[PDB]
Amino acid sequence: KSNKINDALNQHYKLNVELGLVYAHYAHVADDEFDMPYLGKFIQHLSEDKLGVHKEYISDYFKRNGMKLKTDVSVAVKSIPSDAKALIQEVYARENEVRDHVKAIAKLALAEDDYESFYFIQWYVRDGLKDLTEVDDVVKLFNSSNDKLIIEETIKEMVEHEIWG
Amino acid sequence: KSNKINDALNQHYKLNVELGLVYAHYAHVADDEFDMPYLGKFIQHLSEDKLGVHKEYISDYFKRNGMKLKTDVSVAVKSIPSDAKALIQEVYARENEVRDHVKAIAKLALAEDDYESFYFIQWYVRDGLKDLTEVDDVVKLFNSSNDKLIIEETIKEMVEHEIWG
Amino acid sequence: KSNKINDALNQHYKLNVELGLVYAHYAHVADDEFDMPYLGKFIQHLSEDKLGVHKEYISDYFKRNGMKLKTDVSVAVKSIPSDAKALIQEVYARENEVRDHVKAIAKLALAEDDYESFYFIQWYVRDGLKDLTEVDDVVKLFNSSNDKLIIEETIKEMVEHEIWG
Amino acid sequence: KSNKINDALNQHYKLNVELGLVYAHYAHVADDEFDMPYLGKFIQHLSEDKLGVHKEYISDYFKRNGMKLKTDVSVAVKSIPSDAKALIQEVYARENEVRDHVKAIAKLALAEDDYESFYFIQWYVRDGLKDLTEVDDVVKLFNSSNDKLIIEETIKEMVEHEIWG
Amino acid sequence: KSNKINDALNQHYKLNVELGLVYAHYAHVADDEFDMPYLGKFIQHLSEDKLGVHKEYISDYFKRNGMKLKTDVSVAVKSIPSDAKALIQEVYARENEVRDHVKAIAKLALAEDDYESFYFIQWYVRDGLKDLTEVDDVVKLFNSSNDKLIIEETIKEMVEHEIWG
Amino acid sequence: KSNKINDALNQHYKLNVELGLVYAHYAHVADDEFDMPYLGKFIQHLSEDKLGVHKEYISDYFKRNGMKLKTDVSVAVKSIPSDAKALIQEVYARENEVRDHVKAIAKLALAEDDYESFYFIQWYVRDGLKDLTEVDDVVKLFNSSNDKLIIEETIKEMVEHEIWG
Amino acid sequence: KSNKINDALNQHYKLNVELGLVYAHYAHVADDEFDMPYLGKFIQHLSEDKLGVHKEYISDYFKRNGMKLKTDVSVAVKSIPSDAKALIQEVYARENEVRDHVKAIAKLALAEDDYESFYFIQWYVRDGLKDLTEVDDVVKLFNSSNDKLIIEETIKEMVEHEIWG
Ligand SMILES: [Fe+3]
Ligand SMILES: [Fe+3]
Ligand SMILES: [Fe+3]
Ligand SMILES: [Fe+3]
Ligand SMILES: [Fe+3]
Ligand SMILES: [Fe+3]
Ligand SMILES: [Fe+3]
Ligand SMILES: [Fe+3]
Ligand SMILES: [Fe+3]
Ligand SMILES: [Fe+3]
Ligand SMILES: [Fe+3]
Ligand SMILES: [Fe+3]
Ligand SMILES: [Fe+3]
Ligand SMILES: [Fe+3]
Ligand SMILES: [Fe+3]
Ligand SMILES: [Fe+3]
Ligand SMILES: [Fe+3]
Ligand SMILES: [Fe+3]
Ligand SMILES: [Fe+3]
Ligand SMILES: [Fe+3]
Ligand SMILES: [Fe+3]
Ligand SMILES: [Fe+3]
Ligand SMILES: [Fe+3]
Ligand SMILES: [Fe+3]
Ligand SMILES: [Fe+3]
Ligand SMILES: [Fe+3]
Ligand SMILES: [Fe+3]
Ligand SMILES: [Fe+3]
Ligand SMILES: [Fe+3]
Ligand SMILES: [Fe+3]
Ligand SMILES: [Fe+3]
Ligand SMILES: [Fe+3]
Ligand SMILES: [Fe+3]
Ligand SMILES: [Fe+3]
Ligand SMILES: [Fe+3]
Ligand SMILES: [Fe+3]
Ligand SMILES: [Fe+3]
Ligand SMILES: [Fe+3]
Ligand SMILES: [Fe+3]
Ligand SMILES: [Fe+3]
Ligand SMILES: [Fe+3]
Ligand SMILES: [Fe+3]
Ligand SMILES: [Fe+3]
Ligand SMILES: [Fe+3]
Ligand SMILES: [Fe+3]
Ligand SMILES: [Fe+3]
Ligand SMILES: [Fe+3]
Ligand SMILES: [Fe+3]
Ligand SMILES: [Fe+3]
Ligand SMILES: [Fe+3]
Ligand SMILES: [Fe+3]
Ligand SMILES: [Fe+3]
Ligand SMILES: [Fe+3]
Ligand SMILES: [Fe+3]
Ligand SMILES: [Fe+3]
Ligand SMILES: [Fe+3]
Ligand SMILES: [Fe+3]
Ligand SMILES: [Fe+3]
Ligand SMILES: [Fe+3]
Ligand SMILES: [Fe+3]
Ligand SMILES: [Fe+3]
Ligand SMILES: [Fe+3]
Ligand SMILES: [Fe+3]
Ligand SMILES: [Fe+3]
Ligand SMILES: [Fe+3]
Ligand SMILES: [Fe+3]
Ligand SMILES: [Fe+3]
Ligand SMILES: [Fe+3]
Ligand SMILES: [Fe+3]
Ligand SMILES: [Fe+3]
Ligand SMILES: [Fe+3]
Ligand SMILES: [Fe+3]
Ligand SMILES: [Fe+3]
Ligand SMILES: [Fe+3]
Ligand SMILES: [Fe+3]
Ligand SMILES: [Fe+3]
Ligand SMILES: [Fe+3]
Ligand SMILES: [Fe+3]
Ligand SMILES: [Fe+3]
Ligand SMILES: [Fe+3]
Ligand SMILES: [Fe+3]
Ligand SMILES: [Fe+3]
Ligand SMILES: [Fe+3]
Ligand SMILES: [Fe+3]
Ligand SMILES: [Fe+3]
Ligand SMILES: [Fe+3]
Ligand SMILES: [Fe+3]
Ligand SMILES: [Fe+3]
Ligand SMILES: [Fe+3]
Ligand SMILES: [Fe+3]
Ligand SMILES: [Fe+3]
Ligand SMILES: [Fe+3]
């Protein structure tokens, strides 16, 4: 059992918990302040994704290989973006960092010859791009229409691939 | 819109987020270290309950009445109980404090003549006792059997009322 | 976004387009000149496979990661093999080169620490062997029978694995 | 078997292969750069139409009447239109040339007294106008709305006649 | 085709044949001598797993890539563990060595740039942990109960994940 | 409990394990080297028959009557037959020896007045002829056709009696 | 018609009648005195088996071959075992004697060249071991648990093979 991999996956657990809490807030704001209930529903689904299987897969993995789970959570949402476009744009930036963190864990697993963790992280390698694509498909509506309700309608159909999930 | 009620419900949101994160950890430990997968499943369900509708009902309420959501989360799980009995016993203590916090919000709503918040909190008044009963039904198995697998089997049937939900 | 990976996958796109066009022709010839309609049907299915998802997966990948699609196609079918055995034997040689090209992209993704492209190419790593096995199962009929219609019948049942697809 | 008709239909085969490859690219661009996934889906369907039955009907015809298939493909997509309107406008121009090429083959079949090829081309005479109408119904959305997502929505319903097919 | 990979997978074939034969015996003993028919059923299923797809996947792989199958089997069960706990504990030790052997093959495939064998072994990388988890869930019953029939009952329900199979 | 019968059935267990391992290899060879996938499927089914119920019935019998199971397996496949006809011919020779070994156990059970083992072996008396008939029906195809694919087709229908099972 | 076989089967009839009457009593005692209703149900089923088809098959056989039925029944249950373990242990001893008596009839049929009676007794040869296995599976619960209700539960699932019936 690799201590560097244990640390990196504990880091990734933390990231998914805190991110999901930030998105929970961002979802509330999307509906309440920006008056976009469907954008909020899209961001709530991202939040429950991060606080669900993104963290559960790590703790299930630890039960199996002997690694230690660490719960150290610190998050405060102290400024909100100014409009809805900025808000989804901020989600996108956060999801791009996910792909960076995930790529670091994959590199580390190969360096440690941890092939069970390289296998395990392949899920996150794939989901890193899928969640970014979904967010990106939304950031793009704001560049195609000046009408919130046109955008809102298009998001709704998004909520209501053999390689990328 | 009452600022004291806004503050108390932001406090209760925080409590449910942090508690659910603690239970997520306690669930991992119940299965991994104490070798009780069904107790973990019981505690995972409590965790998803706290991090789900317990926090969502508060933020939905705020969208409607004008109150402000605050996300300020700080939780670290720095010691684990020594055995499974102690672990569920600690969950019970935490759920008893829930009923205390909930009773304070109900008292406050009447004092502020906030009848929409008194109505809104009635759910939490009821769920405060129901979640405590469920936890209590588990703490009690540990006083009735010295056999982990007997207990484990009984918990399983718990996972697989017109007043209390 | 890696420029060497962008170039290699643009190369692989080109290969699949041009190959599929060659097989389209080889399928026509299998039925018209060699009087083997089912061998043609087998080779038509390979052609539509190459000109379908083999190229679509690359362009879908580029939409997601930012890489640039390049369409530069040059193919002329200037000599046909002399008999049906030679024809399927030539398909086999072409599919063996696919596995070589695919292995080069996998090696490159690891060298560039492009783990999303290493994941993405795993599909092609697997399909490289599967398409070669299918072709090989046909090249083998021609070593087991001197009778075109016996072979034709066996191919027909081929048209009418948990690791290899 | 007419050599002038063999040549003209080999020319038309080439046209459909190369066109379909251009549209495959134009479809990628419609979604990736112009942020119009449904326009891309419309153009992908045109691409698979051209690289499918438009070329297969010619090669099936050749099997029957004795004509020779020639595969000589050269296409490079070296400039893309500047916006989505221009892009579908370019598809339209290309489809108008199809009707010109098809009309030349029909005229030639009558001049050669090739009534099987005059019959055979009637399909292409009809499809020449149908594909142009479909493209035209899309070029027209861009003259009726300044909103990409309004247009995108209308295209979607187009994707989701007793004379013209 | 790599000779070092051919040798390592022939080694892994041998391991799975011999292991499955040992487990067949261990299953008989679990029921006959230790009077635990369900533990025997659990170990019989492991035996048929090892002597089934664990060896068949290797020989199917060899048909495709050109490697040579070698059948050299030598196994004698000369001492049995003293009780049922020791017996499942011995299975666990044997399954931990599986993960070591599998990790060596994955490392070797990357060193040889054998990406088809790295892909092929990913199955075994995953199954290495899954079979160990299943065995581990049984070794753990013996630390939770002094009662064979309590344990026997719990095993029965085990016989009657998106990452780990 | 007869020690001579215990020894003879331990001998027969060994025979079925080792034989099944030889057939597993012979099945691989039938498909890979001799290019006869259906003959391999026929021989794989014989292999799983020998390594399945042929050995399980013996160990189940021992649980009931008190006899001791012995696992002592030694088999190496050091030469393969030269063609497919020889290969199935070798299976036939091996199955004829089965009937000899089985007849010896039946004779021994009567001599020992072991009527439960005489009953038990009646299954093997019957299956001895049935498995030989099935193999024989295949050895006979090779004397009726010079065409591998004709034979292959006939074997396929064999894979896709009130006295003999 | 053999008089020695007629006598031996009349003896076996007597044995099954008297045994079934003893088990009827043992079943009553298992539930009433030892407080184990499911053990009683297991022993009642043995009783009805002995007083049913075990005696009916003999009298049906006599109708066919000419032998004479004799009803001479004498049984008194004058001491009961001290606990439930002893009680099922006594059933086991009685069933082992069944196999001895049955083996004597099989030997006698061969010595008399009574092949219809050797055939007829094969049923009893087989059932001799099956009934002993079932009883044995119960005697074994008492060596695996000190808890009557654990045992009782396991027996219940026993009440709620191609060679042995
Ligand atoms: Fe991280
Ligand atoms: Fe708000
Ligand atoms: Fe800290
Ligand atoms: Fe590293
Ligand atoms: Fe290394
Ligand atoms: Fe996700
Ligand atoms: Fe992600
Ligand atoms: Fe709609
Ligand atoms: Fe809709
Ligand atoms: Fe709709
Ligand atoms: Fe709808
Ligand atoms: Fe619907
Ligand atoms: Fe609807
Ligand atoms: Fe509170
Ligand atoms: Fe742990
Ligand atoms: Fe703070
Ligand atoms: Fe108050
Ligand atoms: Fe008041
Ligand atoms: Fe609750
Ligand atoms: Fe509560
Ligand atoms: Fe139950
Ligand atoms: Fe139940
Ligand atoms: Fe149940
Ligand atoms: Fe149940
Ligand atoms: Fe149910
Ligand atoms: Fe059920
Ligand atoms: Fe390439
Ligand atoms: Fe032709
Ligand atoms: Fe060029
Ligand atoms: Fe490289
Ligand atoms: Fe590196
Ligand atoms: Fe393919
Ligand atoms: Fe391929
Ligand atoms: Fe057929
Ligand atoms: Fe068929
Ligand atoms: Fe057929
Ligand atoms: Fe058919
Ligand atoms: Fe069919
Ligand atoms: Fe059919
Ligand atoms: Fe043309
Ligand atoms: Fe692009
Ligand atoms: Fe040219
Ligand atoms: Fe003309
Ligand atoms: Fe004319
Ligand atoms: Fe068309
Ligand atoms: Fe057209
Ligand atoms: Fe609509
Ligand atoms: Fe509609
Ligand atoms: Fe609609
Ligand atoms: Fe619709
Ligand atoms: Fe519809
Ligand atoms: Fe609909
Ligand atoms: Fe190995
Ligand atoms: Fe035994
Ligand atoms: Fe050796
Ligand atoms: Fe190595
Ligand atoms: Fe290297
Ligand atoms: Fe396995
Ligand atoms: Fe494994
Ligand atoms: Fe149960
Ligand atoms: Fe159950
Ligand atoms: Fe049950
Ligand atoms: Fe059940
Ligand atoms: Fe069921
Ligand atoms: Fe059931
Ligand atoms: Fe033998
Ligand atoms: Fe081979
Ligand atoms: Fe030996
Ligand atoms: Fe003898
Ligand atoms: Fe004798
Ligand atoms: Fe058999
Ligand atoms: Fe046999
Ligand atoms: Fe047929
Ligand atoms: Fe048939
Ligand atoms: Fe058929
Ligand atoms: Fe059939
Ligand atoms: Fe059928
Ligand atoms: Fe059929
Ligand atoms: Fe008797
Ligand atoms: Fe009579
Ligand atoms: Fe008498
Ligand atoms: Fe005798
Ligand atoms: Fe005699
Ligand atoms: Fe019976
Ligand atoms: Fe009996
Ligand atoms: Fe139970
Ligand atoms: Fe039960
Ligand atoms: Fe049950
Ligand atoms: Fe039950
Ligand atoms: Fe039941
Ligand atoms: Fe039932
Ligand atoms: Fe039931």
PDB file of N, CA and C in Angstrom, chain B residues 48-102:
ATOM      1  N   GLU B  48     -26.265  10.123   4.015  1.00  0.00           N
ATOM      2  CA  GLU B  48     -26.884  10.676   2.813  1.00  0.00           C
ATOM      3  C   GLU B  48     -28.185  11.400   3.128  1.00  0.00           C
ATOM      4  N   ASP B  49     -28.875  10.977   4.183  1.00  0.00           N
ATOM      5  CA  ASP B  49     -30.032  11.710   4.675  1.00  0.00           C
ATOM      6  C   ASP B  49     -29.647  13.117   5.134  1.00  0.00           C
ATOM      7  N   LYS B  50     -28.586  13.238   5.939  1.00  0.00           N
ATOM      8  CA  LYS B  50     -28.180  14.550   6.449  1.00  0.00           C
ATOM      9  C   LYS B  50     -27.670  15.457   5.331  1.00  0.00           C
ATOM     10  N   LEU B  51     -26.833  14.926   4.441  1.00  0.00           N
ATOM     11  CA  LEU B  51     -26.279  15.703   3.342  1.00  0.00           C
ATOM     12  C   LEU B  51     -27.242  15.828   2.176  1.00  0.00           C
ATOM     13  N   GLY B  52     -28.420  15.215   2.264  1.00  0.00           N
ATOM     14  CA  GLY B  52     -29.438  15.374   1.247  1.00  0.00           C
ATOM     15  C   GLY B  52     -30.555  16.315   1.663  1.00  0.00           C
ATOM     16  N   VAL B  53     -31.724  15.744   1.964  1.00  0.00           N
ATOM     17  CA  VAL B  53     -32.916  16.548   2.171  1.00  0.00           C
ATOM     18  C   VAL B  53     -32.827  17.410   3.422  1.00  0.00           C
ATOM     19  N   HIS B  54     -32.022  17.018   4.418  1.00  0.00           N
ATOM     20  CA  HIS B  54     -31.879  17.870   5.595  1.00  0.00           C
ATOM     21  C   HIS B  54     -31.282  19.228   5.224  1.00  0.00           C
ATOM     22  N   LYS B  55     -30.333  19.258   4.293  1.00  0.00           N
ATOM     23  CA  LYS B  55     -29.826  20.548   3.855  1.00  0.00           C
ATOM     24  C   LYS B  55     -30.631  21.135   2.697  1.00  0.00           C
ATOM     25  N   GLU B  56     -31.176  20.300   1.800  1.00  0.00           N
ATOM     26  CA  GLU B  56     -31.911  20.827   0.650  1.00  0.00           C
ATOM     27  C   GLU B  56     -33.198  21.542   1.073  1.00  0.00           C
ATOM     28  N   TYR B  57     -33.917  20.993   2.058  1.00  0.00           N
ATOM     29  CA  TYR B  57     -35.129  21.655   2.536  1.00  0.00           C
ATOM     30  C   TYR B  57     -34.839  23.056   3.053  1.00  0.00           C
ATOM     31  N   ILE B  58     -33.689  23.258   3.717  1.00  0.00           N
ATOM     32  CA  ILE B  58     -33.347  24.598   4.191  1.00  0.00           C
ATOM     33  C   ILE B  58     -33.094  25.539   3.012  1.00  0.00           C
ATOM     34  N   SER B  59     -32.287  25.113   2.045  1.00  0.00           N
ATOM     35  CA  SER B  59     -32.022  26.017   0.927  1.00  0.00           C
ATOM     36  C   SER B  59     -33.259  26.241   0.069  1.00  0.00           C
ATOM     37  N   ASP B  60     -34.125  25.236  -0.084  1.00  0.00           N
ATOM     38  CA  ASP B  60     -35.368  25.490  -0.801  1.00  0.00           C
ATOM     39  C   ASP B  60     -36.205  26.513  -0.051  1.00  0.00           C
ATOM     40  N   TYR B  61     -36.276  26.365   1.273  1.00  0.00           N
ATOM     41  CA  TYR B  61     -37.015  27.334   2.084  1.00  0.00           C
ATOM     42  C   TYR B  61     -36.492  28.754   1.867  1.00  0.00           C
ATOM     43  N   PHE B  62     -35.163  28.927   1.832  1.00  0.00           N
ATOM     44  CA  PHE B  62     -34.580  30.259   1.671  1.00  0.00           C
ATOM     45  C   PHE B  62     -34.941  30.880   0.321  1.00  0.00           C
ATOM     46  N   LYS B  63     -34.976  30.074  -0.751  1.00  0.00           N
ATOM     47  CA  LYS B  63     -35.378  30.608  -2.053  1.00  0.00           C
ATOM     48  C   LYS B  63     -36.739  31.271  -1.974  1.00  0.00           C
ATOM     49  N   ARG B  64     -37.617  30.732  -1.135  1.00  0.00           N
ATOM     50  CA  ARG B  64     -39.004  31.157  -1.092  1.00  0.00           C
ATOM     51  C   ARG B  64     -39.213  32.374  -0.204  1.00  0.00           C
ATOM     52  N   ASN B  65     -38.532  32.448   0.937  1.00  0.00           N
ATOM     53  CA  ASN B  65     -38.857  33.492   1.897  1.00  0.00           C
ATOM     54  C   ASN B  65     -37.874  34.655   1.886  1.00  0.00           C
ATOM     55  N   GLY B  66     -36.775  34.550   1.138  1.00  0.00           N
ATOM     56  CA  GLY B  66     -35.808  35.626   1.010  1.00  0.00           C
ATOM     57  C   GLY B  66     -34.563  35.499   1.863  1.00  0.00           C
ATOM     58  N   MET B  67     -34.458  34.471   2.688  1.00  0.00           N
ATOM     59  CA  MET B  67     -33.301  34.346   3.552  1.00  0.00           C
ATOM     60  C   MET B  67     -32.037  34.032   2.739  1.00  0.00           C
ATOM     61  N   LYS B  68     -30.878  34.306   3.346  1.00  0.00           N
ATOM     62  CA  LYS B  68     -29.584  34.135   2.694  1.00  0.00           C
ATOM     63  C   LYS B  68     -28.938  32.820   3.117  1.00  0.00           C
ATOM     64  N   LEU B  69     -28.528  32.030   2.132  1.00  0.00           N
ATOM     65  CA  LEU B  69     -27.746  30.830   2.390  1.00  0.00           C
ATOM     66  C   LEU B  69     -26.289  31.177   2.667  1.00  0.00           C
ATOM     67  N   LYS B  70     -25.719  30.543   3.695  1.00  0.00           N
ATOM     68  CA  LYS B  70     -24.298  30.657   4.017  1.00  0.00           C
ATOM     69  C   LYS B  70     -23.691  29.264   4.049  1.00  0.00           C
ATOM     70  N   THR B  71     -22.620  29.053   3.260  1.00  0.00           N
ATOM     71  CA  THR B  71     -21.818  27.819   3.280  1.00  0.00           C
ATOM     72  C   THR B  71     -20.492  28.100   4.002  1.00  0.00           C
ATOM     73  N   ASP B  72     -20.401  27.664   5.268  1.00  0.00           N
ATOM     74  CA  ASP B  72     -19.168  27.719   6.070  1.00  0.00           C
ATOM     75  C   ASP B  72     -19.001  26.373   6.781  1.00  0.00           C
ATOM     76  N   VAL B  73     -18.209  25.486   6.189  1.00  0.00           N
ATOM     77  CA  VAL B  73     -18.076  24.102   6.639  1.00  0.00           C
ATOM     78  C   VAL B  73     -16.662  23.880   7.155  1.00  0.00           C
ATOM     79  N   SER B  74     -16.556  23.381   8.393  1.00  0.00           N
ATOM     80  CA  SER B  74     -15.280  22.966   8.979  1.00  0.00           C
ATOM     81  C   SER B  74     -15.478  21.683   9.782  1.00  0.00           C
ATOM     82  N   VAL B  75     -14.944  20.567   9.302  1.00  0.00           N
ATOM     83  CA  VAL B  75     -15.048  19.329  10.068  1.00  0.00           C
ATOM     84  C   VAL B  75     -13.805  18.476   9.836  1.00  0.00           C
ATOM     85  N   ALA B  76     -13.250  17.949  10.927  1.00  0.00           N
ATOM     86  CA  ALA B  76     -12.140  17.002  10.896  1.00  0.00           C
ATOM     87  C   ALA B  76     -12.472  15.835  11.820  1.00  0.00           C
ATOM     88  N   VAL B  77     -12.314  14.613  11.331  1.00  0.00           N
ATOM     89  CA  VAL B  77     -12.566  13.424  12.138  1.00  0.00           C
ATOM     90  C   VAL B  77     -11.217  12.983  12.688  1.00  0.00           C
ATOM     91  N   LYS B  78     -10.922  13.367  13.932  1.00  0.00           N
ATOM     92  CA  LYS B  78      -9.571  13.207  14.451  1.00  0.00           C
ATOM     93  C   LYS B  78      -9.415  12.035  15.409  1.00  0.00           C
ATOM     94  N   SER B  79     -10.499  11.538  16.000  1.00  0.00           N
ATOM     95  CA  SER B  79     -10.458  10.284  16.742  1.00  0.00           C
ATOM     96  C   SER B  79     -11.684   9.463  16.373  1.00  0.00           C
ATOM     97  N   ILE B  80     -11.495   8.154  16.253  1.00  0.00           N
ATOM     98  CA  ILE B  80     -12.627   7.260  16.028  1.00  0.00           C
ATOM     99  C   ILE B  80     -12.908   6.529  17.331  1.00  0.00           C
ATOM    100  N   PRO B  81     -14.187   6.256  17.666  1.00  0.00           N
ATOM    101  CA  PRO B  81     -14.504   5.345  18.779  1.00  0.00           C
ATOM    102  C   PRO B  81     -13.783   4.011  18.702  1.00  0.00           C
ATOM    103  N   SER B  82     -13.709   3.308  19.836  1.00  0.00           N
ATOM    104  CA  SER B  82     -12.811   2.162  19.957  1.00  0.00           C
ATOM    105  C   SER B  82     -13.419   0.875  19.407  1.00  0.00           C
ATOM    106  N   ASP B  83     -14.742   0.734  19.453  1.00  0.00           N
ATOM    107  CA  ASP B  83     -15.421  -0.468  18.991  1.00  0.00           C
ATOM    108  C   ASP B  83     -16.705  -0.037  18.295  1.00  0.00           C
ATOM    109  N   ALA B  84     -17.445  -1.008  17.752  1.00  0.00           N
ATOM    110  CA  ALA B  84     -18.683  -0.692  17.042  1.00  0.00           C
ATOM    111  C   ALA B  84     -19.775  -0.167  17.982  1.00  0.00           C
ATOM    112  N   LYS B  85     -19.895  -0.732  19.189  1.00  0.00           N
ATOM    113  CA  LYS B  85     -20.906  -0.249  20.134  1.00  0.00           C
ATOM    114  C   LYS B  85     -20.716   1.229  20.440  1.00  0.00           C
ATOM    115  N   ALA B  86     -19.492   1.614  20.793  1.00  0.00           N
ATOM    116  CA  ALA B  86     -19.171   3.014  21.033  1.00  0.00           C
ATOM    117  C   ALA B  86     -19.501   3.888  19.821  1.00  0.00           C
ATOM    118  N   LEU B  87     -19.267   3.366  18.614  1.00  0.00           N
ATOM    119  CA  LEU B  87     -19.458   4.150  17.399  1.00  0.00           C
ATOM    120  C   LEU B  87     -20.927   4.515  17.209  1.00  0.00           C
ATOM    121  N   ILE B  88     -21.825   3.517  17.265  1.00  0.00           N
ATOM    122  CA  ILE B  88     -23.250   3.812  17.156  1.00  0.00           C
ATOM    123  C   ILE B  88     -23.719   4.614  18.368  1.00  0.00           C
ATOM    124  N   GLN B  89     -23.125   4.371  19.542  1.00  0.00           N
ATOM    125  CA  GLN B  89     -23.438   5.190  20.705  1.00  0.00           C
ATOM    126  C   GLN B  89     -23.069   6.642  20.470  1.00  0.00           C
ATOM    127  N   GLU B  90     -22.023   6.894  19.691  1.00  0.00           N
ATOM    128  CA  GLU B  90     -21.659   8.275  19.451  1.00  0.00           C
ATOM    129  C   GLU B  90     -22.634   8.918  18.465  1.00  0.00           C
ATOM    130  N   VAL B  91     -23.074   8.166  17.453  1.00  0.00           N
ATOM    131  CA  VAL B  91     -24.121   8.652  16.554  1.00  0.00           C
ATOM    132  C   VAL B  91     -25.356   9.061  17.350  1.00  0.00           C
ATOM    133  N   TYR B  92     -25.756   8.221  18.315  1.00  0.00           N
ATOM    134  CA  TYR B  92     -26.940   8.503  19.132  1.00  0.00           C
ATOM    135  C   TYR B  92     -26.810   9.831  19.874  1.00  0.00           C
ATOM    136  N   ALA B  93     -25.668  10.044  20.535  1.00  0.00           N
ATOM    137  CA  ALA B  93     -25.420  11.306  21.225  1.00  0.00           C
ATOM    138  C   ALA B  93     -25.546  12.486  20.272  1.00  0.00           C
ATOM    139  N   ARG B  94     -24.951  12.372  19.083  1.00  0.00           N
ATOM    140  CA  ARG B  94     -25.069  13.429  18.089  1.00  0.00           C
ATOM    141  C   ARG B  94     -26.513  13.669  17.660  1.00  0.00           C
ATOM    142  N   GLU B  95     -27.333  12.607  17.549  1.00  0.00           N
ATOM    143  CA  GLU B  95     -28.727  12.792  17.144  1.00  0.00           C
ATOM    144  C   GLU B  95     -29.573  13.389  18.262  1.00  0.00           C
ATOM    145  N   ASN B  96     -29.229  13.102  19.524  1.00  0.00           N
ATOM    146  CA  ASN B  96     -29.923  13.773  20.614  1.00  0.00           C
ATOM    147  C   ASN B  96     -29.680  15.275  20.591  1.00  0.00           C
ATOM    148  N   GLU B  97     -28.468  15.703  20.231  1.00  0.00           N
ATOM    149  CA  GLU B  97     -28.234  17.134  20.131  1.00  0.00           C
ATOM    150  C   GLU B  97     -29.056  17.756  19.008  1.00  0.00           C
ATOM    151  N   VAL B  98     -29.302  17.005  17.932  1.00  0.00           N
ATOM    152  CA  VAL B  98     -30.175  17.485  16.865  1.00  0.00           C
ATOM    153  C   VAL B  98     -31.531  17.897  17.428  1.00  0.00           C
ATOM    154  N   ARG B  99     -32.136  17.033  18.241  1.00  0.00           N
ATOM    155  CA  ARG B  99     -33.431  17.375  18.804  1.00  0.00           C
ATOM    156  C   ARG B  99     -33.359  18.635  19.662  1.00  0.00           C
ATOM    157  N   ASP B 100     -32.244  18.846  20.367  1.00  0.00           N
ATOM    158  CA  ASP B 100     -32.080  20.076  21.141  1.00  0.00           C
ATOM    159  C   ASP B 100     -32.024  21.303  20.233  1.00  0.00           C
ATOM    160  N   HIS B 101     -31.219  21.236  19.170  1.00  0.00           N
ATOM    161  CA  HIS B 101     -31.104  22.355  18.239  1.00  0.00           C
ATOM    162  C   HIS B 101     -32.421  22.622  17.537  1.00  0.00           C
ATOM    163  N   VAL B 102     -33.154  21.561  17.211  1.00  0.00           N
ATOM    164  CA  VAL B 102     -34.405  21.737  16.493  1.00  0.00           C
ATOM    165  C   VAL B 102     -35.428  22.384  17.407  1.00  0.00           C
TER     166      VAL B 102
END
